[PDB]
Amino acid sequence: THVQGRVYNFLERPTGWKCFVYHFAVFLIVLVCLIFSVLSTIEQYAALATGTLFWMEIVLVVFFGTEYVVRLWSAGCRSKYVGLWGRLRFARKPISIIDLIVVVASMVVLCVGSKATSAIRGIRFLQILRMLHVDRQGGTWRLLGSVVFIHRQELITTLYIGFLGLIFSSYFVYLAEKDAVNESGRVEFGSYADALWWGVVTVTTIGYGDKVPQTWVGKTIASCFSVFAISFFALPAGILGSGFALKVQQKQRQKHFNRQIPAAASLIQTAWRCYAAENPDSSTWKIYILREHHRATIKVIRRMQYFVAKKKFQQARKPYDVRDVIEQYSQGHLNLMVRIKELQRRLDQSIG
Amino acid sequence: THVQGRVYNFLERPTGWKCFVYHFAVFLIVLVCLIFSVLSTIEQYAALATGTLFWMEIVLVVFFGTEYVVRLWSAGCRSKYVGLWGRLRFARKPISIIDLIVVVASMVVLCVGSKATSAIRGIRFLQILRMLHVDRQGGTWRLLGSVVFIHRQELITTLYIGFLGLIFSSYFVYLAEKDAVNESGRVEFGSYADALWWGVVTVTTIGYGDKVPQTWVGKTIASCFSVFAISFFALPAGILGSGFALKVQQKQRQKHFNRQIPAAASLIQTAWRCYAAENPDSSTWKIYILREHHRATIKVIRRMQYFVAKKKFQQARKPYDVRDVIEQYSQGHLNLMVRIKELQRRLDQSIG
Amino acid sequence: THVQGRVYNFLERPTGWKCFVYHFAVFLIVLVCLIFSVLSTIEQYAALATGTLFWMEIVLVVFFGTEYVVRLWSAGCRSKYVGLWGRLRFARKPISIIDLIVVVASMVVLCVGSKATSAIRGIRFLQILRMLHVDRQGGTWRLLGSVVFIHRQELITTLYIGFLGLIFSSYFVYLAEKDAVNESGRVEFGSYADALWWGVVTVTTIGYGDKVPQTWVGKTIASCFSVFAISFFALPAGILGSGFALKVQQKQRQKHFNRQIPAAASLIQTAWRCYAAENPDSSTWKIYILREHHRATIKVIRRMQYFVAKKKFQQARKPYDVRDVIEQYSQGHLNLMVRIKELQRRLDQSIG
Amino acid sequence: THVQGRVYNFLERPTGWKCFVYHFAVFLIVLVCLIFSVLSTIEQYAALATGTLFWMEIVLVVFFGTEYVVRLWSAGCRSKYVGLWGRLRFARKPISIIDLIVVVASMVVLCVGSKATSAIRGIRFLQILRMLHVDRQGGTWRLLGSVVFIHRQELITTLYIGFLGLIFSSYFVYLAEKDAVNESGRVEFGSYADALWWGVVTVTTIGYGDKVPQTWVGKTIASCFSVFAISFFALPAGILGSGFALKVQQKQRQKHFNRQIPAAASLIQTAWRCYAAENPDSSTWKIYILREHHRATIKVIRRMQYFVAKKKFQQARKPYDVRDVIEQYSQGHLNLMVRIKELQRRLDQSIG
């Protein structure tokens, strides 16, 4: 079946320009629905947008219901999704769960609200949840998650130290400004919660201005805290940006995809030979053509070869590095030395 | 003969100190015009600046028209711009289009508006548009565009996730602050549009302060959103800055321009030999001196040599990398092994 | 025998999931105490939170007092902490000092303040101090400190130049705005201290808005200062983030821990042989199978070998670099040349 | 003979801990003078600080006047500063000019003001200028300048594009908000100058809040401009921080200072041999031991050797790179091939 694979490539792994146009049109219609949701809150546009909302939501719920069914049927092209259990394995993905929730809640809203505040809050939140539909493969989420996980120790360090600085500076400014009254007669720092709110707003470099220290002690503490602890909250962006740039730069020194074909074939062959060694009557035993004690030796040599193949396949999928140069020189020097030893042995044997 | 090229190098691709002085003077007088336009909006300086504007704009439109004509004539020094179609190819460029528009609209304004609000709005926009005249080659735009295109996946990921966080946090803060009334009796969060405005101002770390959450739920949501989603909007600057620094660092390991002369000559020669192989009566067939079936083999060997020449020219234009070390070692080891094999062969031939 | 080691690994160097769960629970209970401290300042929650604080503080002071004693006993598993002097050497660590202070001040407060404003301020500060208990090994502090120390010259340069810019711009804006009166009749820039406060808030990109220049000279100076001197205060975050990313990238090219076993063994052996050369009747003198004047030469050769072993151990603990490639090629080329010299010498000796 | 050098190393190139303590004390006394200047502007502390300022300024002007003379005398230890013209060469340096200005203006102020507004403004600015005295060698300024110059194209690109975006967005927001009146009846955007002030404050992420767009068109334009053009102004900090981190990382792969001793000696020797070739009766002509026409060839071979020595000295002062590996392999492969050719030639001569 090739039609199933073609529609699966159209829907879940788009490539070309037609699929991009289709997905872009879906994104635009979802964005227009979100804009209408925004306009529904305004007083003058409340009635018109809500009146337009009903038919737009009917059209979208029918379209997405049809497309979900088409996609779930087309999932059978893959091997993990063949059969009933494969279909309900497809349904357990987070993106498919979100797609099902958005559609089922849409029908529930259309069937219950049509018969208040909740009846419109639900649909407003549902057309906000539809923006997750853009990323079908989760590529953006995986790209962010890999870099976040790699720099997790640095991120945790910066967050922890920044939180400590925030807590301590907020307490000190609260002590300095506990009783102060500004213009218009209002105590801006009436509690440690107010001090913490001021500290968060200041350390995130927002600075609304609704709470400002007014004593000289508070201003000095705020000056030092703003100078120092702000960098601890600006650090994660720099760490993640430099990481992203470093991965992008490393993408230019990647080995060609055809360079791992022999390594992958060798890994499969070595793994299967290790597997087939477990059969006493296997046909893999005639490679060594009586054989009674050689089996224990062969099963060890095969395991060693399998480990070597694993190492080679691991190395074939990495970008170029100094380790590659070192290994290449080691192998070349060993081969050259072996050749010169062969020359010496031949000369000594022939002429003495 | 060379006067056209000299004036083209003066105008289009400045180099030296005279051209730099000319371009700097043009930039200064354009900036003075912009400052006068700014002063024209002030009540006291409206009359004086506008009175000074007329003669300055007449002088500028005449000078820029003459310089545009001179540049268009001098464009024929190149080979792409020779002739009528070459001139309209030069005029089609975006910078030449902007230059033509700024001049023609300047004459139109000076001939229609001179003899109310639009007649000065247009001239102000036109002298705002004159600052694009500084970059004749588009070097800044190309430098930005290359780095933006290279890091496009990371930029799209950060923008998409930041937009999602903005939308969701704005909705939650709107729900938390829908009915709250601050001092002076004003509902700051009266709609999701107001919540979105607050979210943009907060997530971009501006913090005007015209909309601040006033409930504890809203303040907690704003605290978490400010801590987290702000980095997602500060990320693009870090990504692009690290990219720029990485390109600058890579500029110090570039191969000398003279190292690609043999490679370029070889590429041209191989491409022309592949082209000339298509002629049965060509004079390129006497290199291999009845030739009937050798031609099918020669046309394949020449294509292979052309591909090798393409590879070598591509490698000659890149900075040094680990791939260069690996290729150099491979070639050297192969040559050494061939030499030792020749030693063995000679010894066996001579002494047996 | 080993129970002391198991409990030390449970407490001071946690590994696994049980220790992580224990430490996470401790962190959560400390955070709950901090939240109760925040709620104690609010008027409505003042009575309930303070009433709940007493029992929770008693429970925590007993738990931490027991755990401190258990940990101090368990410190004897190591060799530096064996015995009485080892225990008081453990007690001198900053983290142990903080742990002792938090408990002793807790008992002092519960025994004196319980039997006032200070009696609550002190306990609030003490349960603020309990957040330092999370980092037992100081890993975050050491990770920050290493990168800060490495980039110390750049950090000092940026801080010094930013401070100079802040001082000069604040003085100029003070001169420009000394006599200005804004709306509501209040001189925002009444002194150089006010100008400095404005400068700090502006250069840290906070911008509360309580002090804004109102003259055109002040606005122009503020515009230039904001455009330029702000980057000098945003620089440290970028420097430290790029440094963190560079260390993380360098972590992927580290040599395996088993590669330094021969180097470490060789360093120990060479150091001990240098030490044992000092004994005239030592048994290390029989390596050379009387011996009167050879001792002065042996004691020098051993020192040279010790220095070589030190170099090898230093190199074995570093990540891969171009120096490794250069040294490997040097050694391999020397060996190959020696082998070819042996070939030539053998041929000339045998045949002449 | 060495006293002058010792005091010069004490003053201009401090090293150790005594010189560091001296310079630290000078920095602290200058900072205390700056704090007193700040306190002199405050109304309550105006009299006391000004009264204390007289004696402090007298003591400092005498100390700095004595130390300037001591330093100028001690400058003769170097070779560039020997003699009268050397002393006026030392005095011409920017730091020495600043030191002379701060002292002469101090004496002038203390002799004229003591015997109104300007008489205090000048001395306040003079104690502000004393902070430049800390950096005697200009190390921070040179470190900043090198990195700024290296990334000059990127910095210019970002600044130019950000300026264009600021200008255009300010004009569009001015058009959108020209006639709008906020609460309290005040036109925040009364002119393009006001729009430009708003644009600078917004694009630098300060956000005072004294000017905020109030129409939906203005808010939309401000939202897009804040999202995009802010990164163009945050870029320079990222570029410079990544550059600083890259230089710091490059500092760990620097060659030892002793690797350039032979190269420097060879460069000096080759340069002097090229110089001495110009003398027909020189004693450098006996190296080739009459000689009539060999001079033209010798003077060319010497020039070639000088160029090679220049290249080697340039390479010896750089950190390790891929070029070093490539050159090392090229030389080693050439030597090995020459050795194998020698083997072949010897064998063929002997037996063939």
Add this chain to the structure above:
Amino acid sequence: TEEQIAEFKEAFSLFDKDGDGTITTKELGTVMRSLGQNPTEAELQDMINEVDADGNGTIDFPEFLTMMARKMKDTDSEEEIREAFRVFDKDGNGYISAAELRHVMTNLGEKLTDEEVDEMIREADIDGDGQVNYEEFVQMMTAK
């Protein structure tokens, strides 16, 4: 683990043959040639490097025990085998043609013999469809 240590020691002794207590490149190559494989010196060095942890260039009994203590049923090993199989997966649907699999197995890498390639195809046969599923293949390979 009496039997396990006994058989591992017997296997180690079948490689050592010297009583030294270390297995070298020469001894490994000698045994391999006794089996009839004439391995290259580079191949033998690669074989030794994996087992050898300390870095002295030989294999001690602790290293032999550590290497024999591994398992191919590991989740990472299964993922590695699947990723190796994905290189020859053109469509990406988890199926590889029987003819392409046979060609790759016989002509690339270790160059498996025809009889063992047919044995693998018999084992990895989804009712003789002709487009073998390489996920169940890895499943039963790692099942052991």
Add this chain to the structure above:
Amino acid sequence: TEEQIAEFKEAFSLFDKDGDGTITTKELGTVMRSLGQNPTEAELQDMINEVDADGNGTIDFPEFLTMMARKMKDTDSEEEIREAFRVFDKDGNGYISAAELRHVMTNLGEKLTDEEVDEMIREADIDGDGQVNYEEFVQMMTAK
């Protein structure tokens, strides 16, 4: 394209001469020497590397077909030839002197024969003015 496959198979068989189904450096060099080229081993390895995709060191019929299916009329190929020509463009106006072009062609790279260099100059002749326009040369070369 059945005729194209037939001619490609004929050329592959002419290169092979062995019936194995792969082309090695030895066979490629043998044919090149039969034509009178005496190529270096490094040159032969470089020639093999481009065509060889799988990495086994030889050329199969699919690899031969893929290599024969390429084109020099590609836009990237045209831009590459123009960039190669710009290395000898002193000004940047798209013109290169006939004498300089002849010197470069005869004395650098593949060292074209004088007769074929004059043939190239005849083909790229802007009315014999002596300053050839190298963009028209690439235009005609890529037109095939």
Add this chain to the structure above:
Amino acid sequence: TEEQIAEFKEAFSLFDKDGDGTITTKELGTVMRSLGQNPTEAELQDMINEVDADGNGTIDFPEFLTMMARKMKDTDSEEEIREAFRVFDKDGNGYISAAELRHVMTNLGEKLTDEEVDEMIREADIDGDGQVNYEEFVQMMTAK
């Protein structure tokens, strides 16, 4: 002092035996073989590289004096020896087993002789406990 200079000059003369004023790899190897150590050329080059500062490939008297003027009692040297000892520390508590220490010393690196290994164990014996403390070992090693 003058005695130190005199003995260092005597040692330098013993190494040189030539009066040139420089020590080369050939001379160092000659003396080492006179002691009976047959060092490798790479080993001799490594030995020369540390002492040789200027980089000319030999050892002058100032370089010899600088090398002899060092000391193993340095804090960095003590920390380095401790770090080397921590590689064989399993628990991390500052104790290394006597059997493991003996095996490592005899079978790794310079391969110390059995008699000197027993001498070290006698020196590094905390009342014959069997789990030697390697901190006091480094302490007394760096004491002199």
Add this chain to the structure above:
Amino acid sequence: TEEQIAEFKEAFSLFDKDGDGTITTKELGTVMRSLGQNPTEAELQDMINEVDADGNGTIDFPEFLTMMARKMKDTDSEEEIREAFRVFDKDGNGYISAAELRHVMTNLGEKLTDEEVDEMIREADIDGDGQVNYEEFVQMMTAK
């Protein structure tokens, strides 16, 4: 500059002899050995690399002219010589001892002859003080 091109062509012809129009490592070494310097092949390749721009491995007349058209009186050359002199400057005050300069010149790098070292010291003698100023040395060296 007809005379300049004249003697440059004369020198190029003296180096060439073969008449081809290029100078190779073999010809350069032949002339150098005719002068009596027996240069190494690596040295000859290094000498050729600087002059050779096109990269063909030889030296054409334009390359020879470009190399002969340089100058040692350049500001960068003067700064380079000063930086080379600063390596042996201990204090950093711009003075280097006569004995240290003589030792470095005779024993490092090109290993200048004693007679020319004394000639240099005579030229670089500030009234026979014994602590020569290496700035005036470079100043008059670059004066030419």
